[PDB]
Amino acid sequence: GRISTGSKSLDKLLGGGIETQAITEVFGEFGSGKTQLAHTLAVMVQLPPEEGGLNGKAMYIDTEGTFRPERLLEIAQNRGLSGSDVLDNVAYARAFNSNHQMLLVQQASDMMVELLNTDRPYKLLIVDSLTSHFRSEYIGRGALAERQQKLAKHLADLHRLANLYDIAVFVTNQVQANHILAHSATLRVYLRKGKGGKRIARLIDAPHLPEGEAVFSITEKGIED
Ligand SMILES: COc1ccc([C@H](C)NC(=O)[C@@H]2CCCN2C(=O)CNC(=O)c2ccc3ccccc3n2)cc1
């Protein structure tokens, strides 16, 4: 049981879609479609398995004010769904610094246990974006050891949530050409801009999946082939 991205091409690259019990990271420049894929996943996860979802709820942690509840409505309506119910099934939190971002993962644990054995459990946790607060707050050579200690602890908490509660953790990371915030991820996907409103996804760290690329479009339905 995997969460469809909305793109048949990007799902085949991922072996069916985004996995639970894993952290799936997309990285790329600004504008490559990371936040759009996250918004689509927040909707897709609500669908029944036959339509590409997991009959679940989504949690969205927003570190840069990128969350657009209207965009969720747009995606839901164009896919034949109630924009109201789609919004009812997404838990949302704005993280204003890296300490708040870390506490939210701890608090997400409480929300997940509660729904764990119900009809619509949480199935997706989004962190958009994972690193930005760490880059901006840990300033100077004197702060780099603590920066990695906190980033490492934060990824350990996310891995633990994913395994405990059988949820997909989807994180976005803004890697620019051209400063390195190393961190663990189960799956890494590089996004870049393509021909017009197309985007290209490349598998970077994928243990046994065949390497390769996939093309997808940003449409009114979220992400599409
Ligand atoms: C009509 O316009 C809208 C605008 C936005 C929405 C969004 C989608 N819904 C919400 O904001 C809903 C409804 C009001 C409170 N609320 C929450 O989700 C409150 N969330 C939390 O307390 C919380 C706590 C810890 C978390 C840790 C990780 C991730 C998420 C977390 N969320 C709905 C309608």
Author numbering: 111 to 288, 303 to 349
Wording from the paper:
We replaced the naphthyl ring with a quinoline, converted the Ala residue into a Gly, and introduced a 4-methoxy substituent on the right-hand phenyl ring, leading to 6. Compound 6 has a clogP of 2.76 and an improved FP Kd of 8.0 μM (n = 22) against ChimRAD51. Two independent X-ray structures of 6 demonstrated that this compound was still bound to the FxxA site with the quinoline accessing the Phe pocket in a similar orientation to the naphthyl in compound 4 albeit with a shifted binding mode discussed in more detail below.
